[PDB]
UniProtKB/Swiss-Prot annotation, chains A, H:
Conjugative DNA transfer (CDT) is the unidirectional transfer of ssDNA plasmid from a donor to a recipient cell. It is the central mechanism by which antibiotic resistance and virulence factors are propagated in bacterial populations. Part of the relaxosome, which facilitates a site- and strand-specific cut in the origin of transfer by TraI, at the nic site. TraM binds to three principal regions in the oriT (transfer origin) region; 2 are required for autoregulation while the other is required for plasmid transfer. Plasmid specificity is conferred by the TraD-TraM pair. It comes from the Bacteria. Belongs to the relaxosome TraM family. Homotetramer. 2 homotetramers cooperatively bind to DNA although they do not contact each other; cooperativity is achieved by DNA kinking and unwinding. Part of the relaxosome, a complex composed of plasmid encoded TraI, TraM, TraY and host-encoded IHF which binds to the F plasmid origin of transfer (oriT) in a site- and sequence-specific manner. Interacts with TraD. Probably also interacts with TraY. Its main location: cytoplasm. GO terms for cellular component: cytoplasm. It holds the Pfam family Tra_M. This is Relaxosome protein TraM. SUPFAM superfamilies: IHF-like DNA-binding proteins, TraM-like.
Length: 107, 121, 118, 118, 118, 118, 121, 107
DNA sequence: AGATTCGAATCTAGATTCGAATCT
DNA sequence: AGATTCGAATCTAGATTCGAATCT
């Protein structure tokens, strides 16, 4: 479907400018209608990999902070002290070591 | 100056929809060109912003670290919770049971997506 | 760019069959070239993947699997830790951590979060 | 039988690259059609395999969904566990786990981390 | 050379109808352009013909008609002349021009001649 | 609706010629598509008319056939008439219609005439 | 030297048919290329001849003349045959009858191809 | 269907020569296979407008000669002489005149 | 002897773009 | 305002040509 818009000289300049910019970036097939279409699409906008990646990174980061703290408090629990097996000076680097080895599997 | 753009059916619908919406809001003089113009103006404004300003691998790496870290931490926290008197008392958190149960849970879950008998691919 | 491949009768049948299959699935615009392109794309990906394999890593699939495990594991572990925390005298005392409330609340949180993207 | 597929520049490059690679490996008779044929054959095989698998092999979207749930679940659970740990007498005693300090600190951590990539 | 015409819905229907009609008559390769071309060719011919008309002559059709008349006329006339020649005493005398023989002989000649080209 | 027809150079010339002709007749808005449309319309009308006619209007082949028959018939008839005229007493008398002279003369005439064009 | 020609199904059939024909005539060594070669040789020979050497309008004109001439001549011959005593005697060749009959014949014949109610075209 | 013939150098030259000749005559799309095909077609050959036009011209020409002669003899028939209406010095030019007028209708 | 591969190429087919233009 | 004409153009689609080449 084709659209005819009557725009002001400002808008017009900016667009024809964009077309130029593009061709100049190899984007051969850049065109007036071509570019206005992209701009309309963009204007309208104003699942989702990026938005999703973001949420997951937050949740994971959050969980990690929380567990760090929980860990420290568990270590302070009398029953833990008693066992003699949860000395934070040991567990902690052990955990770091685990993470590093794991990461290194893939990087 | 007049612009002729050839857009797809999606875009077109959305716009003609907007024109309708507007007239319906008293905005008498709402029109196709009229509204597209406003939308173009809007799109330009953003485009500029984007102009004036994502690494998978680095991100995959951070996530693997955080997750691995969290897993190590929980393993430890779990062991300590089991040691808590109230846990001992309940008789429901025998590590020798819970622990393999958890391994079992992990395996079944992984196998939903990475059934062993569907390997090589 | 256009490619001309001379394939055997097997391959040919299979593909023309696929075109049929598709149109038959509403996929109107299914075509010979159309489908072969998709198949080439597919074949390349595996070739690459196989390639990447016998070299060093990396390996999306292996990674997706490890993350799913760790995440699943963590989730089982927290479930259990949660239940034990609830049993802690100090928790009982506060009257703010009844499993019969927290638990569904957590379920509720998960659902709303998932529904953001689904 | 001969196939004409109209592929994109990516695919095209990759293939012409493969032809090069091969001749360079002694594979004299390597050719465009030649190689695309082999790639088609390959692509078909996988398509079949996927076809067979189970709802048809791995499923990005279904997997993304599971992971989002597990992670969200875990986060809700930890928030609660955290609150209960803070209530543990030994925690109160240390004076180091004032939930009102820790909490914003955790939020702060999250934000800085996300901002690394976004 | 390719032509792009913007026609009205009437014309369009009629043509797409013709394509249908054709395929339906075995004419496998019938197509839109295909048929429009034939129609253009046809339209030109009439245009020319009409043209040629209001100018001077010439005029295949008018000519074909006049020749068919003259030929037909001649044929009727000869039939009659033949019958009268047969009645001429000198013919009777010769014993070589019995209608019951000549006539079928003539029919025979005509048929063989026609069958050369049909 | 828009039509794309792939025509031959003849047709194409004729049309582009017509466009020229028209503009030259003041018909400002004459155009390629413009004119082809008018020609299509025209072509359709005739096609219809032919359709209606009777076995569908004039028929070259059927006509060629009739003419060949009539002409062949006439020729057989005349050959016979000629032989009988020669037998007429008045002919014998004149000494000018010896069938053995006339006959080759006629053959000779035919040959020279045909050779004008062949 | 070898030639690759892409011919139509007609031509191809005809040739492969010829090969068959030949072998069937003892011509053992008959072959596709074999026979096409012979056919090419043959085609060249003719082509040359044609090389070393039709006007519709002029021809239409000659034919119209001859036919018209023949028609005038027959009209006259007809009139004379009618005058022949033997014709008079038969009572079957009254020009007043034959003549319109002949006109009738012509008209009906023309109308087979140039029905009056199908004019203008 | 494609044919591979192994020809001698003579034939080959003649053909490649023909291809050249043609291109040189504007016949852009002239080609080896292209031309050999035409030559095969031709070789094999060794209704029909031309053949038909020929036969019709013969028959008509023949008929015309014959009628001329028949005409002359009819004129000699006593009954014709008697009528006084078939004087060859009159009829004949009359016939010529008819033919000319008829031809002139179309040329 | 002819099957078959190969890739540059040309063509009819028709969907779709583009922007200049005229008339609402 | 937007309908519509116009013709240059580009693209996917697949049939068909061409001749150089290798293997029967």
């Amino acid at each position: 479907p084709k659209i005819q818009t009557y725009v002001n000289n400002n808008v017009y300049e900016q667009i024809t400018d964009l077309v130029t910019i593009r061709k100049q970036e190899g984007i051969e097939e850049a065109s007036l209608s071509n570019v206005s279409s992209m701009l309309l699409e963009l204007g309208l906008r104003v699942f989702n990999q990026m938005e999703y990646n973001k949420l997951m990174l937050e949740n994971v980061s959050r969980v990690r902070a929380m567990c760090t703290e929980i860990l420290k408090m568990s270590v302070l629990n009398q029953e833990s002290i008693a066992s003699g097996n949860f000395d934070y000076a040991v567990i902690k680097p052990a955990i770091d070591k685990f993470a590093r080895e794991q990461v290194s599997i893939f990087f």
